Design a protein around this ligand. Structure first.
Ligand SMILES: [Ca+2]
Length: 769
């Protein structure tokens, strides 16, 4: 490996061998069907709300999130980079697809598949990833840096449906070598959203944009239809000329054939036919190819950028609504703009690289933090783009001021912005994209007094319940299978209108969003204030025994939606205390004296009773009335965690908080698989995992990262990082279970998982507060 020196890969990048087999991989631990796409994954490409494309460490474009809200894992084999090399003085060169695998059937059989093992590495530090190619049969060593412009405090480039592939080629040998790099791409119009005739009318065109010191050559792969539908638009691939390279192309090869129409050209001398052909296809799949060829002298390096763009302007949800995607604000809505997007990338990628470096640098340059922590912190952010993210720029046929946004809980549980989860998972948004965060919270504020008296069948018990109750915050803002933003509370396993955490978490998120954006946005507090008061007032009505605290009802009436709480719980009770303290402070800021007095009175009573009911001398009991009420819960003091972040001070005595956190580390972490797998949710005081429900026996990745941040704030530095380390290890390490780029909600002691690609572990960003 002599190429690594010619590029700049951070030491904290996650790494794996190209073609590596992983032997320890986890699988779902539930009875019902659940997504398991394998460990062959990678950092995604694509902006927020753009649809994303997961290119895996083996080189394949395989995890398709272009249909917003859906996860489709299938390798489109025509989509590749390939290389040709010929040493000066040799009769023949060699050509090789840079993919560690081969197609299942006979399509593209002429191409040279099966990129060999131990011949290159993949690296990832989201939003960047890299591949190096160090192959005994490729005298010139190659590397590519690939990325989308995901940039904090930037809502423009961050939305773009584009990727850049910046290639570096170096000749360490003593002979001249001819090199070609070729990008192939299938015209994927019809891959989704088209009910019949999936390739029909697809056609490919070549664009040559020649100006002074810029030549771009690109293929635009579209359809003859000018219809405005979810399925129609354009893909583009292309390259920018640099000194010392020539560009060749082929407008049309057949992907549903043996591929030799293209490969016989590339494998001879690495130069394509430059054959334009706009003939539309009928049944056959078609694709395009863009190549560069150059001669490298001994010791010479060259850099050349390619790009990919996709202009699919319309997203459709299962309930029928069609919306424009955010990037259409910048490029237009007609679906004929892929070249414009590509050109912007090819002309500006160096600036984008610097913008990414500028935001990563403060963390990367901090030598007090271990590299593993940086690996997780950056790579968990994959989910912000990869989570079925929807960001609208108008309803089709509809102009508002704001652009509604939603991130999925996950794909198995296809719900937008699940509030009990975003309480943990939304830290990157408030910290790095606060305008999006505030928009989402205003969306929630708008739902507070919505009433929907129609009934649904509750999954857990088969009872009928009212869909949406006035004054109760919704569980979620809908499903991609139905009507995001329009039909809320898609979730139906439990009735969230009687949950005892959502209303408090809502208030805490509001005040958080004020505090973490500088305590200056009084207009945001003003917008949400009525909803905050309503939410707390409705929750107070659920206090049955008049101890000042809402009563859990001996069912799973909160985020642990199969783990029953009864009476006063540490979890909901502490969230309540913190929410009251937050509302007091908002009342002071907004000069709402009567609110300040009321919530102060409720707080003083509830705080006294919380402490009396639950403090046992070592920790806070799980609750007052359940069978295992004395279980040690990892999340027992969630309200105090948020109070720390919100600078609300002590809602519970410092000494008792410290004792509880030490107990949690001693038990829920260190007595669970020797502290190497995170914090298990429930442990009995005898040091055995609480078996009352599956959720008690799970580690929740986002709960654990949040607990680590709580420990960190409280000066328990070793415990905090040791706690977090087990989550990093399980996710990323050779000794873990292979969950990179699909961090799950949960695992059990055997390492097997529930709900891959999950929002909650974004809470790792709470460690950066
Ligand atoms: Ca009560």
């Amino acid at each position: 490996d002599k190429i690594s020196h010619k590029i700049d890969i951070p030491d904290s990048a996650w790494t794996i061998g190209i073609g590596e087999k992983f032997k320890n991989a986890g699988h779902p631990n539930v009875k019902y069907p659940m997504i398991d796409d394998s460990y062959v994954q990678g950092a995604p490409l694509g902006g927020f709300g753009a649809g994303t494309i997961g290119r895996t460490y083996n080189g394949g474009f395989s995890r398709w999130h272009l249909e917003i809200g859906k996860n489709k894992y299938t390798t489109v084999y025509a989509n590749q980079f390939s290389v040709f090399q010929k040493v000066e003085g040799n009769k023949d060169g060699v050509a090789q697809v840079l993919y560690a695998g081969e197609p299942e059937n006979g399509y593209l059989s002429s191409w040279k598949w099966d990129y060999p093992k131990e011949s290159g590495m993949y690296y990832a530090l989201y939003p960047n990833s890299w591949y190096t190619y160090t192959n005994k049969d490729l005298p010139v060593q190659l590397a590519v840096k690939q990325f989308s412009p995901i940039i904090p405090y930037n809502y423009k480039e961050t939305s773009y449906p584009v990727a850049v592939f910046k290639w570096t080629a170096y000749n360490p040998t003593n002979k001249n070598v001819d090199v070609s790099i070729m990008f192939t791409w299938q015209n994927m119009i019809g891959f989704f959203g088209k009910q019949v005739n999936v390739n029909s009318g697809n056609f490919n065109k070549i664009i040559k944009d020649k100006s002074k010191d810029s030549e771009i050559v690109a293929a635009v792969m579209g359809n003859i239809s000018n219809d405005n539908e979810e399925w129609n638009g354009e893909y583009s691939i292309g390259v920018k000329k640099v000194p010392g390279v020539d560009i060749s192309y082929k407008a049309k090869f057949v992907t549903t054939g043996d591929g030799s129409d293209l490969w016989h050209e590339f494998s001879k001398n690495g130069i394509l036919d430059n054959k334009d052909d706009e003939t539309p296809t009928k049944q056959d799949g078609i694709g395009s190819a863009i190549a560069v060829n150059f001669k490298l002298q001994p010791g010479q390096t060259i850099e050349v950028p390619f790009a990919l763009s996709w202009d699919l302007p319309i997203m459709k949800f299962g309930g029928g609504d069609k919306w424009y995607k955010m990037y259409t604000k910048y490029f237009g809505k007609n679906g004929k703009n892929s070249f414009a997007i590509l050109k912007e990338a090819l002309n500006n990628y160096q600036k984008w690289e610097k913008m990414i470096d500028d935001w990563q640098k403060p963390i990367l340059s901090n030598k007090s933090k271990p590299d593993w922590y940086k690996t997780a912190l950056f790579n968990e952010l994959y989910y912000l783009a990869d989570g079925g993210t929807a960001w609208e720029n108008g309803k089709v046929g509809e102009k508002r001021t704001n652009n509604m946004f939603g991130l999925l809980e996950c794909f198995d549980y296809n719900y937008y912005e699940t509030l009990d989860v975003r309480f943990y998972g939304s830290f990157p948004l408030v910290m790095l994209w606060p305008d999006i965060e505030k928009q989402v919270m205003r969306q929630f504020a708008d739902t507070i007094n919505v009433q929907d008296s129609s009934e649904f069948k509750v999954g857990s018990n088969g009872a009928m319940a009212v869909k949406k109750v006035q004054g109760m915050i919704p569980h979620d803002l809908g499903s991609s299978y139905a009507l995001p933003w329009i039909k809320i509370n898609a979730y139906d396993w439990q009735n969230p209108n009687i949950w005892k955490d959502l209303n408090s978490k809502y208030v805490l998120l509001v005040y958080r969003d004020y505090v973490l954006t500088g305590k200056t946005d009084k207009e945001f507090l003003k917008y949400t204030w009525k909803s905050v008061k309503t939410a707390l007032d409705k929750l107070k009505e659920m206090d049955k025994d008049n101890d000042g605290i809402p009563d859990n009802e001996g069912i799973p009436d909160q985020t642990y939606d199969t783990w029953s709480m009864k009476g006063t719980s540490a979890y909901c009770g502490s969230l309540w205390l913190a929410a009251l303290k937050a509302a007091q402070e908002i009342g002071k800021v907004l000069k709402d004296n009567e609110a300040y007095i009321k919530y102060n009175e409720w707080y003083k009573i509830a705080q006294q009773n919380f402490e009396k009911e639950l403090w046992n001398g070592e920790y806070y009991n799980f609750d007052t009335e359940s069978d295992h009420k004395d279980s040690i819960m990892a999340d027992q003091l969630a309200g105090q965690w948020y109070a720390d972040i919100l600078r609300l001070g002590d809602i519970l005595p410092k000494d008792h908080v410290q004792k509880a956190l030490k107990k949690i580390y001693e038990f829920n972490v260190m007595k669970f698989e020797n502290g190497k797998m995170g914090a298990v949710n429930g442990m009995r005081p005898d040091g055995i995992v609480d078996e009352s429900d599956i959720q008690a026996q799970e580690v929740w990745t986002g709960v654990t990262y949040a607990l680590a941040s709580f420990m960190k704030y409280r000066g328990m530095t070793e415990e905090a990082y040791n706690t977090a380390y087990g989550v990093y290890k399980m996710t990323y390490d050779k000794s873990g279970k292979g969950y990179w780029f699909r961090t799950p909600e949960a695992w059990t002691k055997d390492g097997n998982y529930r709900a891959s690609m999950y929002m909650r572990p974004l809470s790792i960003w709470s460690m950066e507060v």
